Amino acid sequence: YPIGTEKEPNNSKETASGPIVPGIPVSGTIENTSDQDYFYFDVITPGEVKIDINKLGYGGATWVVYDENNNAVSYATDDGQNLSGKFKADKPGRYYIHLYMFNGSYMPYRINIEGSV
Ligand SMILES: [Ca+2]
Ligand SMILES: [Ca+2]
């Protein structure tokens, strides 16, 4: 049952919206800098995962991906418009995308994931 949009409240790892799978974009909005948005996806077989989150508003945002044990495995790079990154998933399991805005009023976004998901 893959998601095409966030489902609030998703403001902690324990309420993360998902699963997110490749080929199905996921919409949402960072309501303001207090709105944390967490998502999850499931790695079934080891392999590369690529993440691109399109910024559809103004502001400074970023993401980090945590594995099931709360280790950071990937950090976004901002190109101005898109927040992107990739990592090698050596173990199957659930991964959590933590998306937040450190400066900005309101930010619609679109999440795309690719690879071993
Ligand atoms: Ca949100
Ligand atoms: Ca949220």
Side-chain angles (χ1 to χ4, degrees):
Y1 308 100
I3 64 156
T5 196
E6 64 170 339
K7 186 138 175 36
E8 293 282 0
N10 59 359
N11 313 308
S12 67
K13 168 202 189 181
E14 294 79 19
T15 47
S17 300
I20 308 183
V21 309
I24 304 175
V26 178
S27 284
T29 294
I30 310 165
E31 297 290 327
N32 49 54
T33 57
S34 298
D35 185 29
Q36 306 284 323
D37 290 352
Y38 292 76
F39 297 86
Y40 72 85
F41 54 95
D42 286 313
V43 172
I44 299 309
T45 83
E48 186 101 319
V49 169
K50 285 174 264 156
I51 291 156
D52 296 85
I53 299 187
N54 305 139
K55 295 180 291 178
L56 311 169
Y58 301 100
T62 186
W63 56 258
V64 189
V65 176
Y66 280 86
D67 64 17
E68 251 168 69
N69 294 309
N70 309 111
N71 309 297
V73 296
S74 178
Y75 292 80
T77 303
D78 190 356
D79 77 359
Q81 304 278 316
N82 300 328
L83 305 178
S84 72
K86 56 172 166 73
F87 74 99
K88 196 86 180 278
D90 269 26
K91 278 189 200 81
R94 187 156 287 179
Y95 290 81
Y96 295 91
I97 307 179
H98 177 200
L99 175 63
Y100 67 99
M101 178 162 68
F102 52 85
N103 195 349
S105 170
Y106 188 72
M107 196 187 280
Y109 57 78
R110 177 104 117 163
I111 308 164
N112 312 281
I113 194 157
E114 303 195 295
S116 283
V117 183

